[PDB]
Amino acid sequence: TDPVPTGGDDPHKVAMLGLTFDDVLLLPAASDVVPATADTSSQLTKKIRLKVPLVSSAMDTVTESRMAIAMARAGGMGVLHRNLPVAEQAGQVEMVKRSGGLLVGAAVGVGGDAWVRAMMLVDAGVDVLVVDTAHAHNRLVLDMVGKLKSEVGDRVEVVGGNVATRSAAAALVDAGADAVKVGVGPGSICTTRVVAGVGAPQITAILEAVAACRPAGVPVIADGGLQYSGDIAKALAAGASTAMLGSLLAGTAEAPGELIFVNGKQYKSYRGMGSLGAMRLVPEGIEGRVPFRGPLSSVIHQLTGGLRAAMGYTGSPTIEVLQQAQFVRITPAGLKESHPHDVAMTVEAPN
Amino acid sequence: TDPVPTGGDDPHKVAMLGLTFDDVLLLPAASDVVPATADTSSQLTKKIRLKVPLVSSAMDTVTESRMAIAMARAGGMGVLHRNLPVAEQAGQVEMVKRSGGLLVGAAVGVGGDAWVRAMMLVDAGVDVLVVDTAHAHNRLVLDMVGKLKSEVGDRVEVVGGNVATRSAAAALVDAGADAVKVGVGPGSICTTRVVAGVGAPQITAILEAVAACRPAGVPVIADGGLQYSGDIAKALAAGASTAMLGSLLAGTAEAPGELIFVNGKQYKSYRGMGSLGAMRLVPEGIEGRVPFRGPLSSVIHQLTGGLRAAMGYTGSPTIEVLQQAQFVRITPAGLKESHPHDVAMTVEAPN
Amino acid sequence: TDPVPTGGDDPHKVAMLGLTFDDVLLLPAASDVVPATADTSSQLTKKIRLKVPLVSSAMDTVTESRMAIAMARAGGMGVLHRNLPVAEQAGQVEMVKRSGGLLVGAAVGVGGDAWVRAMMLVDAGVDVLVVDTAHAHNRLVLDMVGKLKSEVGDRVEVVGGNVATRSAAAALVDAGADAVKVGVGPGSICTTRVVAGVGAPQITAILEAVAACRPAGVPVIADGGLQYSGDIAKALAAGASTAMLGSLLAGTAEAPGELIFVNGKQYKSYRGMGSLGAMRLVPEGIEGRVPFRGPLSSVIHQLTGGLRAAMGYTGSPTIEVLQQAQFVRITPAGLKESHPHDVAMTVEAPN
Amino acid sequence: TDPVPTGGDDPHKVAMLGLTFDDVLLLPAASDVVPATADTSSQLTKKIRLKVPLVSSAMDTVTESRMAIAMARAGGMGVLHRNLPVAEQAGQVEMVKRSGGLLVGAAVGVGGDAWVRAMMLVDAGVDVLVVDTAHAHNRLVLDMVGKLKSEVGDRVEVVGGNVATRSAAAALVDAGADAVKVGVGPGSICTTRVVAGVGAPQITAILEAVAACRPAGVPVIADGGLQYSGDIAKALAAGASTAMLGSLLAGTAEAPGELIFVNGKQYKSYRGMGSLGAMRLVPEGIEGRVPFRGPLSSVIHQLTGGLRAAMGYTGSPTIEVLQQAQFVRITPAGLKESHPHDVAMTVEAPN
Ligand SMILES: C[C@H](Nc1ccc2ncc3c(c2c1)CCOC3)C(=O)Nc1ccc(Cl)nc1
Ligand SMILES: C[C@H](Nc1ccc2ncc3c(c2c1)CCOC3)C(=O)Nc1ccc(Cl)nc1
Ligand SMILES: C[C@H](Nc1ccc2ncc3c(c2c1)CCOC3)C(=O)Nc1ccc(Cl)nc1
Ligand SMILES: C[C@H](Nc1ccc2ncc3c(c2c1)CCOC3)C(=O)Nc1ccc(Cl)nc1
Ligand SMILES: C[C@H](Nc1ccc2ncc3c(c2c1)CCOC3)C(=O)Nc1ccc(Cl)nc1
Ligand SMILES: C[C@H](Nc1ccc2ncc3c(c2c1)CCOC3)C(=O)Nc1ccc(Cl)nc1
Ligand SMILES: C[C@H](Nc1ccc2ncc3c(c2c1)CCOC3)C(=O)Nc1ccc(Cl)nc1
Ligand SMILES: C[C@H](Nc1ccc2ncc3c(c2c1)CCOC3)C(=O)Nc1ccc(Cl)nc1
Ligand SMILES: C[C@H](Nc1ccc2ncc3c(c2c1)CCOC3)C(=O)Nc1ccc(Cl)nc1
Ligand SMILES: C[C@H](Nc1ccc2ncc3c(c2c1)CCOC3)C(=O)Nc1ccc(Cl)nc1
Ligand SMILES: C[C@H](Nc1ccc2ncc3c(c2c1)CCOC3)C(=O)Nc1ccc(Cl)nc1
Ligand SMILES: C[C@H](Nc1ccc2ncc3c(c2c1)CCOC3)C(=O)Nc1ccc(Cl)nc1
Ligand SMILES: O=c1[nH]cnc2c1ncn2[C@@H]1O[C@H](COP(=O)(O)O)[C@@H](O)[C@H]1O
Ligand SMILES: O=c1[nH]cnc2c1ncn2[C@@H]1O[C@H](COP(=O)(O)O)[C@@H](O)[C@H]1O
Ligand SMILES: O=c1[nH]cnc2c1ncn2[C@@H]1O[C@H](COP(=O)(O)O)[C@@H](O)[C@H]1O
Ligand SMILES: O=c1[nH]cnc2c1ncn2[C@@H]1O[C@H](COP(=O)(O)O)[C@@H](O)[C@H]1O
């Protein structure tokens, strides 16, 4: 019997061909939609629907109270980071709620300290708890999701993550998750892929997770690797219901941290929560910077405008119809020309 | 049942593998043709044939009256842009017609203002109206094509675009188009692919559009992404009858705009019609510059000379025979060496 | 009958599609393992098991007595290079043994001088002889392995290499090898691939060698091409039992050679044993430098920490279970973003 | 019926997947050969065998009398260029013959002037005439080959080229060619691929030409695209019997032209015969420079040493056995690391 063409005799050892955002484009289709008439609302969890399908990352250079307030007023939501004392994180929940009863989420870990943290966040009025781990396919993480749903599931929605396979998504569904968050390795500041050699390209990861979550009516959050407004449309077309953003929002005025004027240009700090500086395990993130991008409200306008364009091109009046759109796969020659190919750019572009 | 190897259980979710110009080369074939004896004429529309199968883009940094006159004298045609008052665009049609009864086209949009614009262009003597949109697969665009053909179709030829699929091309054929223009996302100044995440590699887009248009006798115009004279031969071999050029003609003396002397070299401005500067919707084009290339007549000579070489290599005495030629697909290793590989270039090359 | 799509009529002329480390990632799986509880021990040979599955290369800029002592104290082993007089190499074996009865190996060639060298190394107390060649699929190399096993196989373990195919691995098994070393062409300082045009991508080479060695109970050593801690996890998941490292250990304090302070940064020399300088045949290696990395103990801690992370993600409590893990294949678009994509790195990272 | 996945309904429109040298490596195999015992002789034509399987290109910056003498003394042969008067080219043939009865070839074109040129070269004692064209699949080129074989075929061997397909090779065989030269588009100074859009990756081109020529006993010359000594071994393993070199020999002392000292380094001019400067048709080559490489004898020693290494690794005692070797295909990740990957090179390498 002949060998597998990539080696050995086991045809499942190399189990899939993984695609990322840069591997695909959305195909145009018959349309009665123009960008102005599209409806961008979508489910975050079983019980919570957002006007704009975007949430901010649970990172100490992205989301504290100011970012959470701005995201909710823009039609989305923030998830408050957990690298601070319990009493401080609960106090930031209260600040958001005192600003008009806006929606807000907060991250917790696994264990006894995470349990006390969760209970205080619920008492402060949080709307969504996010069980926030690098590898949710573990009975200890699944147990935390189920116990929270048992104790406080009548008062708050419970998200679990992160996963990158169909079987891991199915395990979170069976544990009672109200939404499943997808992304192992794709983040802009991530080094898991080179430190551990572990990961999963995000378009294939979303397609596989959706195959378990959609038949059960559980929404999927696409978390990490989004670099452009067009990546939001690709993630939702693959079947996700919302997208979580770190790098694209870290440059805004509302993100924590001070402006950095260096060599006449302006930047802000952005770092992984598994970086050496955040942990103070071998590190699995870097510490860096991103260009300054101005007010959050202006960034969200550009991002939703790109999503609305995609809905016009694909004939999608709602996000539920966008989830039925088709892709074409592209080669390396097709990608390299999508970044403005061969024209000395002379003026600024907002998107 | 086993999953699709790229994810999920739907084998049509990723519907095709899209090829662009850099993915293919034309195979040599048995030949009684040398470059001097080839015939480059081809249909622009059902009723109009050109001596050279090239038209200039409807852009305010490419085609006004001077470019339209030069293109017609060289054996091709210009399409006048529509980012100016109706009375000014109609006046430029008259200037061209006063220069020897040369052929000329003009762009119009969709709606009531576009209707008055179209009627004035017809009164001024235009030969071709181009219904000029980003996404022609919409009943409002199809309706405009059909109404123009109904009202003035005896006096003028009507083109519709742009499309990138077989089903969209078929819809324009059924609406009565005299030619179908292909290109969603491929232009050198385009950012649709990153802003909306939407597009289609141009060799596959032409192959699919031709599968609908050729059986109906409707010519296809390949619009956008052509970077070299060899790309013209590839587009026509895929089944197109003419090609539309922006970047390759924006550097010429006849294009609108002033020379730019910077750092001892010379350039000219070139910008998308969906850029912030042209629109004065989130932008879907950039504003930039290209190197100065001299007189139009000299550029067209180099472009047609490359096409004539391809006709010799493939044994094609006419464009209709070139449309029957075959491709070989190449890998990333093959492309990277096609741009002069590993020889410090010391002298200028005209093509 | 139709041709093979890549040319000719022989479907076995291009016999396989070869994958390297950068072509694959490990998929996360169901897990009861966290990095702290993983067990990293593994077989070097039939009779020798290591606490950490890493050995240092037999190169005159990587392993003499100081490196061999440090590797053994860290739980791995060193292989002493053979570019020095027999009496000097045997003396370095004694120095290691005088430092606590630590484990040590030593390289030998093929022929009569290599035979006297081997006998002196055995008298000095070496634990492992490595028959060290560029192409072990030769009866002269197979003969050396068998004769050593016949004469001294009761006192010492005998490794043979290097190979890159299933048939070559099977020949070493039949000759009596206690372990088989895999790698023809992959090393960081290797030029065999461009000088001779010969090689085999290392993930496919390991998969093929394991298909012959695992059914016979013979461990496989993955030798060359490892650039990151994650590559260790990939090599072992493909079926290898240990990995051999040159570049990743050449920068350490214990490697032979003096520090190089140039332009404010620090480096150390690193060269192939088939380079012109080492041979003093056309050369098949280069002479270069690598950044200084500090104490060996600190480098091994970072490398094993990355391996432990991979064991947590894949649910592997032992190396024998890691050898059963699955891969996903990635495209060029997926790789280019795994090296920290689009975030100006500002702080140092240890791994 | 479903479409072809790359577009349209014709499965032969994209007819093959073309591989170049960088797409493949030679697999090691069972061997009783070391580099010193290999035999590198091979047929140039039906009646002429060379000791080293290499010829120099017919270019006015590569081969005049000095290069032809040095190539013959090294065991190969030169082909004299034809961009000079007939009386001068015939005089250079005589100079070579006066230096010891060495072997020599000379290029001619097609037509009446080429006929007089050919007759004078034969009277001067040339051993091989090369009918030298860009596209030999034409009855006018086939006619020239047949007429020369009819008139002078008893006294001289007749080569025809260039071709890139099985059908074109078969046509030259039927016309009576004594050898067939393969290469449309691959040369380092070629711009045919971008000017005309025409070409064929060279490993696939050789495989296809050999499928026609080997059953007829007609040797194949691989012409263009060879960048490293390892590329010679790849070309011969694909079935060619000799290789023709331009860039790799243009830097030598014996090549025509003067040394160029610029910025402390030394270069020499190298240009295509279809460049603007050589023709004094749109140009299909560039004018450039290459690094100075010293005496020819030293370059040929390095090239044959790399070939001998490949023969050891593949178990080939003769070139006829090397023509039976197997390839593994590699990905972009495998190639990028074959050029010395990630080690600051500090010393010079001869190959
Ligand atoms: C469930 C458990 N969660 C915690 C929470 C707080 C801790 N606080 C302090 C310490 C430990 C803690 C573990 C364990 C190590 O000793 C100190 C845990 O295993 N988490 C974990 C393990 C490995 C990796 Cl890679 N990532 C995360
Ligand atoms: C994302 C999380 N990993 C870490 C790792 C190190 C940390 N070090 C310090 C701090 C935090 C850390 C979180 C969180 C914020 O407070 C400081 C994580 O994967 N947990 C986890 C829990 C249980 C299981 Cl079974 N597997 C994994
Ligand atoms: C050190 C490392 N720190 C973080 C922190 C936050 C993260 N947030 C999101 C993601 C990752 C994160 C890693 C990694 C995967 O991509 C998503 C971490 O906890 N490693 C880890 C390894 C194995 C297992 Cl069993 N448990 C945990
Ligand atoms: C058919 C229709 N054409 C026009 C023409 C002129 C207009 N002039 C002014 C304004 C509008 C106009 C629309 C609409 C917005 O309000 C101001 C239109 O929908 N075109 C359109 C919509 C969305 C996108 Cl992305 N691209 C183009
Ligand atoms: C190409 C065209 N898009 C735009 C967009 C914004 C513009 N903004 C300003 C101006 C122009 C603009 C054209 C044209 C020139 O005058 C100024 C377009 O796609 N129209 C269109 C019409 C109907 C439908 Cl259903 N879908 C799309
Ligand atoms: C803002 C944007 N402006 C332009 C202007 C001219 C163009 N000309 C040609 C092409 C494109 C163009 C885009 C985009 C696709 O490639 C071809 C545009 O109108 N967006 C748009 C989006 C969705 C829908 Cl339903 N309607 C229109
Ligand atoms: C088995 C044999 N081993 C030795 C050992 C020591 C030597 N010492 C000196 C010399 C030779 C030696 C050969 C042979 C050449 O003359 C001088 C040998 O053939 N090894 C070899 C051959 C070709 C290549 Cl590429 N790599 C390695
Ligand atoms: C790795 C080994 N190749 C070389 C080549 C040249 C050398 N030149 C000088 C020195 C050494 C060399 C080793 C070793 C250290 O001493 C100096 C090798 O492949 N041997 C080998 C033996 C038998 C057969 Cl059948 N095939 C190959
Ligand atoms: C000159 C060259 N020198 C070395 C030295 C050490 C090496 N160590 C490991 C590896 C290689 C090495 C090459 C090359 C393949 O990758 C693994 C060598 O001996 N060439 C060689 C060629 C053909 C045959 Cl039959 N015998 C030997
Ligand atoms: C067979 C024929 N050979 C010659 C030879 C010498 C000539 N000398 C002068 C001139 C011509 C010549 C043609 C033809 C053009 O007028 C001047 C020819 O057609 N060769 C040719 C044609 C096109 C291309 Cl692309 N490459 C080569
Ligand atoms: C390689 C050859 N092409 C050229 C083109 C232009 C030239 N211009 C000037 C000169 C030479 C030229 C050769 C040769 C040297 O003298 C000066 C060629 O393909 N011929 C050819 C002949 C017959 C047919 Cl049917 N097809 C093609
Ligand atoms: C202008 C151009 N000049 C050269 C000269 C020497 C060459 N030598 C070798 C090769 C090529 C060469 C092109 C091109 C293909 O690759 C091999 C040439 O003659 N074009 C040409 C085009 C079509 C036809 Cl029918 N006839 C000839
Ligand atoms: O240190 C880390 N390593 C890996 N992933 C991380 C780390 N910190 C945060 N993440 C993930 O990266 C996401 C942000 O990715 P980005 O939007 O591509 O910048 C977060 O929402 C987390 O899921
Ligand atoms: O802003 C824009 N976005 C996208 N495509 C555009 C825009 N403006 C013009 N185009 C298209 O780009 C073509 C020119 O492409 P190029 O020849 O590759 O420079 C035009 O003929 C239009 O079809
Ligand atoms: O000159 C040489 N050419 C090719 N491979 C070599 C040479 N010297 C050593 N090697 C191999 O390269 C390995 C180290 O590779 P690295 O860890 O990628 O730097 C060694 O363990 C040998 O197997
Ligand atoms: O102007 C030209 N265009 C294309 N190919 C050329 C030209 N001049 C020479 N050649 C070919 O290029 C080969 C040399 O290629 P190289 O060895 O890769 O530099 C010659 O032997 C010819 O077959």
Query: Roughly how much helix do the residues of chain A carry, as a percent range?
Result: 25-40%
Instruction: Give the distinct bound molecules.
Output: ligand VOA, inosinic acid
Q: Give, in order, the helices and strands of chain A.
A: EEEEEHEHEHEHEHEHHEHEHEEHEHHEHE
Structural class of chain A: alpha/beta
CATH class of chain A: Alpha Beta
What is the strand tally of chain A?
Answer: 17
Using only CA atoms, what is the Rg of chain A? 20 Å
Q: What is the spatial order of strands in the main beta sheet of chain A?
A: 5-6-7-8-9-10-11-12
| CATH topology descriptor of chain A | TIM Barrel
Oligomer state of the chains in this structure: homotetramer
Taken together, the total number of domains of chain A comes to 1
CATH architecture title of chain A: Alpha-Beta Barrel
**Through-space gap between termini of chain A:** 54 Å
How many helical stretches of chain A?
13
Biggest interface goes to:
A-B, 65 and 66 residues
Percentage of residues in DSSP E strands of chain A:
15-25%
Write the CATH homologous superfamily of chain A.
Aldolase class I
Major sheet details of chain A: 8 strands, parallel, barrel
Characterize the overall form of chain A.
globular
InterPro entries (chains A, B, C, D): Aldolase_TIM, CBS_dom, CBS_dom_sf, IMP_DH, IMP_DH/GMP_Rdtase_CS, IMP_DH_GMPRt
Catalytic activity (chains A, B, C, D): IMP + NAD(+) + H2O = XMP + NADH + H(+)
GO cellular component, one term (chains A, B, C, D): plasma membrane
Pfam family, one (chains A, B, C, D): IMPDH
